[PDB]
Amino acid sequence: ISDMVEDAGGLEVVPGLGELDAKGTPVVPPLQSNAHVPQNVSFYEMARHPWEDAASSWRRDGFTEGSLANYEAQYRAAERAVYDEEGRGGHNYWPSREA
Amino acid sequence: TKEYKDRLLSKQFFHNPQAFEVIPDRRDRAVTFGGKWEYQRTHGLPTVDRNELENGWSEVEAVTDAEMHVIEQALRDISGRRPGNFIKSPTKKNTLQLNESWWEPLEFGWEQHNKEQKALVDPTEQRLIDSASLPFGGKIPPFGTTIGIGERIREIAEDYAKGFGLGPHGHSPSHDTCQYNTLNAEEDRVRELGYKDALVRLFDEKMADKDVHQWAVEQCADGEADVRQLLLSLHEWRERGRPPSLMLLQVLSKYLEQEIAAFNEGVPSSVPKLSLQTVDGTLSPSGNSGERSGTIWADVEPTAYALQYASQANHSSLDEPFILQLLKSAQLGGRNA
Amino acid sequence: MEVYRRITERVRGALWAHHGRLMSERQFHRILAYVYNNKYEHQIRFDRMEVVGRAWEGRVEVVTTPAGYLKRVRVNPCLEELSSYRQQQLILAAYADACAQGRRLMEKAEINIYKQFLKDLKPIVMGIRDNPEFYTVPEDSVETVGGTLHMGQGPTPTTYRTIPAAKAHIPVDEIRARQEWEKKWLNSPQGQSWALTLRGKRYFALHGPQYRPRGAPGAKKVTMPLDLPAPYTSMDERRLLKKNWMAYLDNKHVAEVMWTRAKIADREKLQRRLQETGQAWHRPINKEAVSRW
Amino acid sequence: KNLNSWYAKGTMRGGVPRIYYAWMRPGSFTRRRFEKMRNPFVDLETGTSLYFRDTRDSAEAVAHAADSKGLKGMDNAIDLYNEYRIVPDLYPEGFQWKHKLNTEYNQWRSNTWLTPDLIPQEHRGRFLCNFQLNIVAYDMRVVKFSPKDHRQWIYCVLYVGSGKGIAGWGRAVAPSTQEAKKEAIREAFSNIIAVDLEQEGPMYPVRVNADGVRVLLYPAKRIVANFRVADILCAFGFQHAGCRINLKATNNPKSPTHTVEGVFEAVKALRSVSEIAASRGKVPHSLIYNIYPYLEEIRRRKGMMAMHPPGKDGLLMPDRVVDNRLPDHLKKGYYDDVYWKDFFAGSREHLNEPKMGLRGDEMRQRLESAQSRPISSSTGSGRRTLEDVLKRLGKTTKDLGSIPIVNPRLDIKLPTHIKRNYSLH
Amino acid sequence: RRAEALWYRATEDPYFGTPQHTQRQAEALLRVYVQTKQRGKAIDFMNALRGSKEFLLGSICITPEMQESYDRLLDTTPHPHLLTNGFTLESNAAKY
Amino acid sequence: FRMKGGEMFVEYKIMSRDHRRSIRVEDAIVDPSVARTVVPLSWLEQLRSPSLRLHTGYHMEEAVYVPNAILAGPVVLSITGQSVPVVLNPYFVPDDTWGIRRNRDEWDLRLGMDAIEQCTLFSELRPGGLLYNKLPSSQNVTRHEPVRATLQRYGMKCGLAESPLVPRPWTRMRYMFIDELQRGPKLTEFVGHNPRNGTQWRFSQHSKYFRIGVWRETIRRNDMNEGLHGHSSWQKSPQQAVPEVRLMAPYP
Amino acid sequence: MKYADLELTTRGEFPHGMKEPGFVKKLDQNIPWYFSTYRSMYHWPITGDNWSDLNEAEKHHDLHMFYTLAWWKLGEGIFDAND
Amino acid sequence: YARGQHPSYDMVYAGPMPEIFPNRYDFRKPTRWDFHDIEKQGKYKTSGPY
Amino acid sequence: WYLQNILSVELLKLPSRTNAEKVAIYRNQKHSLSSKKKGEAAQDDEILANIIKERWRTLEFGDRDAGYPCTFSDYIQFLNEWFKSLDEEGMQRLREHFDRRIRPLLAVMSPVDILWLEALTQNSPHNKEQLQRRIAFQTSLGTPEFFDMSKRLRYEINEDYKVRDELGPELFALWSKAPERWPPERLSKMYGLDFTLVRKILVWHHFKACYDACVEPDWTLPKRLFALEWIRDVRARKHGLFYGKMRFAEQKITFYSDRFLFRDLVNRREASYANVWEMDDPYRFLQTEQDYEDYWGDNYD
Amino acid sequence: WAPNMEWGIENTPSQEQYQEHVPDTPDADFRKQRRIQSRPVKWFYESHYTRTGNFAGFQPLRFMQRRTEREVRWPDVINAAVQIQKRKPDAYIFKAIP
């Protein structure tokens, strides 16, 4: 502590800090703190996800746009032709060899 | 921003212009008017101003004590013992399949997958793996002999079969001293009980020859219940022992009512009585204390269940002509495998 | 720190002993590094703010940074004459009081750390747990080679179930409906007017991502919460078994030893809980729960 | 101030190459048994409670009065990877991959797999070092199997070494040249010796006494020893060493035997520096760069980082039971809203009924995997099952796409197929 | 490379070295590159000129001589993808 | 480093070249127009820290005019943002003729091009940065030019690596070779006196001394052969002692 | 570019280094210690910044790499992305 | 530092200085002991590789 | 042939999918369930790259009058025009190609594979028959996998931190945004490895990042991360007059008592700092002019 | 920065380095594993600071060693390892030099 004070610039002797005035108030207004809980320092809204905005700490090696557009699209086409082949609006679990 | 992007563009351009052209000329490197160390005033990306760096974070929701109790509840739930990890059943003990090329010859779970194909599927379209094609008699070679193939095979089989978790006595099975399964006492107990259920045993002794489709199109009226769903849960409960579903359990409550009473006759005031009650949709037999069906076991391995079950052979697990089936079975005797 | 080391060690052991999945240690440490940078980003601005302590009646005014760096000491000149020792102990008590205050805020923000990191590890345990294939047994059940025997003590537990037996209900659904209620609202009479009210502009700002201009930090669009359905996603053991079985055996071996030790943790936390509320005894008396096996 | 330049040291031996370690020995290079918890300690459970000794006082652990939850510092796990390396790594892992066998490792990397009868039993699948054999000097001693019968037993000395660290010497007696050579080579691979070459020489004068030959290994700027002894030290890899024997080559006894024996005896008597240190219980200056992560984590655990949550132990004890396990007829529908219709197609562990939901095509594919199980007489019939019917047609058992039959080798009528499989789809 | 090492030693040398490069040293190095016909080097050097500290201060300038001579190098000298003013046909290349 | 109106304000810590005595300046101005730092004379003694290398306080100390001031140096400035120290010879003007006290406790201290030529702050000077406005006038500076106009008058056409001839600037490193992550640490032998003198390479099989040994290791491949054929590169094993062998590899 | 359809009958060997040595029955010098004893002057790898006017090191490494890629046929049909 | 309380950073703590960048491949520079023909390496031409 | 079999990719066609194939590979990729066969996992990009590998494998050399794409003359003539065309960055990318592909094989080369090597360009070794004979004998002496150089680089120690997931700079645009606020100690948590190797990864990471932003790297980052090691090399040189880097064989042989570090440890436990950046800045090592010169001696500027 | 340490391959001349006079050809000195040698001025092009010095405070061990002894007493062909020298032909055939 003695050296924390030294590197803290010695004790600044200011006369009458906690000494109160006749009317009950203190002379030499005290030192006032400005501390609270920081309300915008969640690290996750910071080191977010790179391409999407799901700001957290989980890795998800995504899929390129295009290679997901075409991919999922033709999956939908292949499912609509396998499972619902005769186009009656009904999903036939038993399509033909050809479907 | 525009400032960031533009400082970055000038940085990249004066670092190498010929990449920012369409016909990139030869990019050999030449001198820097700064001095042999111009990287000191070129290097790194552009950097932002610090006050904005550190302040410009928009206020973030105070995920509150509510959500905290939620999540702490989530973990203090999952932290519970999932059933078998302590003692892994032969299916998880033998599901191993190494992508290495020495592994596949000695088909790892050969004899176990054979036992499962013998018991739980029809002899008409099924597989069976052979210790003939399997290297070492199909079994592992003893210790001293093979210069280490069998060594490392036993060792991978060990480390994939080791059980982890706390057991019913309070120790990992390899704690220094607290032994489990001493002299196979756990399989002793599990034989001397068997995983046998009152409710499905009664459903059996009631139907006792009926084709399940017959019984189901009986108990499902025209509009009362769907034969699809009732058959589904019927089967998944009959073999592969589960707690019977809600609908199927109520159908049982009505259909077995005679055998249910015959089970419910001689109770005194205090004993358990098989009460097919589904007050809450919790099918866990420890939630019912095993009364909604006559189950000791709060969750049975489907497959050791089905192994005992198919060894109970009152079901027609042989589609053959009957007198031939019984003649062959008697003559080829009790050692028919 | 070891709170989150314990937490993620138990979650590792979970996502393996509850599903044949392994978490990539790349991820295991991206988690802890995100908590550590949580704490660095708190400590940063905590070092731009002050706590003021004061010794007897406020004669010594110690100005400090909440981390405990003594910056200034305004003294009353009735203290310069105490001694060298009692000066020391009085400025030390004023420091100590300020430290108490700063650490009060420090612990008031470490709960915010707990809570952001918890919102973080939400979709992971919600992944392993809020799927049709998530089930435990009662901790008393004598788990046998083929299943789980029964308990004998404290009959009839209350098996919960966190999942709708109905069709699937997932948070992405809930959030899309959240924005739809929000939409219908900002269409509705009280909607469009509250939106022109401060209560609406305030919400728009503090919660409207899609309105961040080109350049602003933060979520620059709206995000559905995360989805990691374990029992329906082989996480790493696929990659490990493909590349090399050695890494596979050891990665699963660690995840299993980790869950084993979190089990030992629950066991000793329970052990004290019982020796506290009179259930257990301070030296073994009940051997037949170990010697009959 | 040390006018010994480090840049002009070591005596050149022509082409003889000697290994040098960049930083630390290849043994102590890898640390899987400690990063991956593959050890008797992690197995044997005892002591895993200490990592949670902090829950002695429940109120204290929730309160987090002292950060010192850790068995060894601030955390239970602080610098598990560096700080523990501070100890003289006397017993290092070494080579521990079971990727390909000991045999195939020894074979790819060593000229010993070619020579099996030479390595005795213990070292067989072990070595990965290309050993150069140097036959010091053959001799001939008469062997008297009887008074009337005498043989010429040639007696070899040879040293099988590789300057990569490992070198043994064997002398043998056997009736023939090549048989005595083989016998001595196996005795050498029995007398194999290694050396902590981290110090690249002795760091203190080793004054040993072999079987009559007073040896002194000492530190020199460079290998300064006999031609033979120097090639032995180069067979060990000693860059800065020097052995002197008998004080001078007129001092008896001298012999190729005694020379090889003496130098190898001295290299055996040598103690490593890490072993010297640990023997004195002291931390070697060399390895103190491992505590620097822990010293820095000390210095950087000030304030917020040492701050531990209030009331949050991390040990979220067991309380209740959860069962999301739905009936299979239900999970068959559960995700149909959320993912593809009929999520659960074919997971045996998931769907307690393994076959349900599948289209007959994928079931046919399971069956294509399945093979033809033999037919006992009762099962064998003069009826032609759809198996051989579709054989005669030749078309396929996969052709009947629209036909709800899936397994033609079932001896059941078309609706019996469709009813045994009506429950499912 | 010799002229490059000269340029750097002119920056660095404490006795005979000049703190800011002279348009004399710059044009002289340009004409060295123009001499030995270094296409990529001359390009990068004109660019690092465009980016220097002396250029920005306006103390050192790219002379009209520099521009025209450097352009003439980028003409005469051969491009990796393009025919430069300075490719002389082969009547026989019709072979290929 | 910040701008409030474009003009940059850096935070630095001026230090005696031995970093013994130091004096911080919260937000000082960065004018890329005065080629020297002008600090008040009062610090000529605060930062005079007489070390040994500099017997007296400073090295250079010359009565200059701008005579108003004492040009003194070298003083080790250190700007908050930058990691490289910036060594200067600041003008030390007195506070009399030049009362640098602008407001209550402020100072009107400005960081000079003498420094910006050593900071990463220099990159703010080539057109595109935050100081290309404040740059003084000259023919190589068009003041209010569009930055893109300057880049394209220099030869900007497309993005970075837009046209597919120029490679991608992020396949520039498809692999970082960190030895203990990939296949272990090399086996490092030497042929010479030292690791730094001798060379990586053993003498190939073609040596005069090795050919008998190679002939034997060929024909009698299963017995152990004396010779120098081992100290060669060619070895009996499938594994040849060619340098950068990774001796701890999992699969060799 | 700069094409002329020349031919070539004798390429070198593959410079794999491990081409057999021309075998000899006896040695012209029957002294083996001369290979073990041969010292030389030191090979100081760097003198000051190792700068040299021709790029004597990078140039030679590039000219060895060039022909070795040639002989290895650019070395990629073996494996590049089998992983 | 003057007081003796600074957290000392000495060179006992200095880890290994790793070869951060692989230097360059060291192709076998030919010597007078790499001559495919025992003729150029006579006793009368070659007294050693360099 | 090169344009055809490399750069004219569209002229390549894949195995055209069936629709049960499409739907099923979707279904067993978008959720990996329990107990999957190993037949659903070979992706179409790995398949394209394996097909190109087979193209380059079956390219053959000889007079083009036959079915050959080209002769040795044609191919090495193209190689020569190109290798003359290569600039700096071209040569950086080419030498990296060498370093990653070929150079790791030159150390696992074998006198067994001399046949397969010469097969690559279809050369004919002088003793082709004596070779084929012995090489066949040696290749007999070991498993067909034990001798195919096409599979001798297939394992990596420490399989958890692969290199494929470090080519994307970890939290890149957070330390590209204030690399004075982001020492190595903030990210040395990102890797559960030894400390020296973690800093080594970090400097390689900053390099990957600066390269990809196409900005000049700061070649003083290795120095600023290993400052302790930097000054220790400087003083090791100044002490034992060598050049290069000090190896553990040259260290001091002081033996420190068990608790040498208590003085340093209490100074570390108590020393607080006005803010975080004085706590960790790269010049916390440098204490005297000797320290500053041994640091910035390399940096003559 | 490394000094220009003495007794390199390049510093030393022939009769010291090897034990015969060897031409100082500025072209194709294969024995110094050298290909060409442009010889610009020693210290002209390098930067000035690099001129660190000339260290030679050690043994020229190629050329002269401390405590020289015949490595191998037998056979008589061996000296200290500092006597590398090729073979002296019989009567010296002197061609006519064009």
Side-chain angles (χ1 to χ4, degrees), chain I residues 149-161:
Chain I
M149 217 197 284
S150 88
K151 210 162 319 302
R152 276 185 227 162
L153 271 60
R154 59 150 142 80
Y155 283 151
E156 271 179 26
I157 72 192
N158 178 221
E159 289 266 310
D160 283 354
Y161 300 95

Side-chain angles (χ1 to χ4, degrees), chain D residues 293-318:
Chain D
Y294 172 44
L295 287 182
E296 195 81 335
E297 187 183 292
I298 279 276
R299 188 185 62 94
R300 300 172 97 266
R301 211 194 189 73
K302 267 62 221 166
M304 201 60 239
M305 341 283 309
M307 181 63 36
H308 269 130
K312 322 301 189 310
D313 50 26
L315 303 190
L316 308 200
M317 250 203 75

Side-chain angles (χ1 to χ4, degrees), chain G residues 54-68, chain H residues 24-30, chain I residues 91 95, chain J residues 29 32-37:
Chain G
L54 295 66
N55 226 30
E56 262 97 354
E58 189 157 272
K59 163 156 50 87
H60 290 207
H61 157 64
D62 286 1
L63 293 198
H64 280 275
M65 172 194 55
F66 276 170
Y67 92 80
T68 209
Chain H
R24 254 192 292 92
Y25 184 38
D26 183 77
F27 289 102
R28 177 193 284 282
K29 282 322 199 310
Chain I
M91 196 83 71
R95 61 193 48 212
Chain J
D29 189 326
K32 301 163 186 156
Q33 299 144 350
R34 192 198 87 221
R35 185 211 163 241
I36 203 191
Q37 180 193 38

Side-chain angles (χ1 to χ4, degrees), chain A residues 2 4 8 12-15 17 19 30-31 33-36 38 41 43-44 47-48 53 56-57 59, chain C residues 26-27 30 34 37 42 45-46 50 54 59 61 70-77 80 88 120 218 221:
Chain A
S2 357
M4 282 216 81
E12 180 184 8
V13 189
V14 286
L17 268 179
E19 309 280 30
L31 283 154
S33 77
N34 38 334
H36 56 264
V41 300
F43 172 61
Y44 298 79
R48 331 206 287 271
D53 312 314
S56 170
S57 196
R59 291 186 80 80
Chain C
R26 156 82 32 192
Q27 194 55 259
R30 190 137 197 258
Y34 267 59
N37 303 14
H42 278 92
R45 294 115 183 128
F46 261 22
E50 281 316 89
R54 43 190 91 269
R59 313 292 184 84
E61 300 189 350
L70 170 42
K71 275 156 69 115
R72 274 181 60 177
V73 228
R74 282 154 106 232
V75 180
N76 205 306
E80 69 202 12
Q88 278 190 353
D120 170 30
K221 272 310 162 253

Side-chain angles (χ1 to χ4, degrees), chain G residues 5 62 70 73 80-81 83, chain I residues 46 56 64 75 81 95 101:
Chain G
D5 207 315
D62 286 1
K73 80 156 191 178
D80 260 10
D83 177 25
Chain I
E46 174 60 29
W56 278 93
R64 82 168 128 284
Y75 142 77
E81 82 198 42
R95 61 193 48 212
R101 311 312 218 295

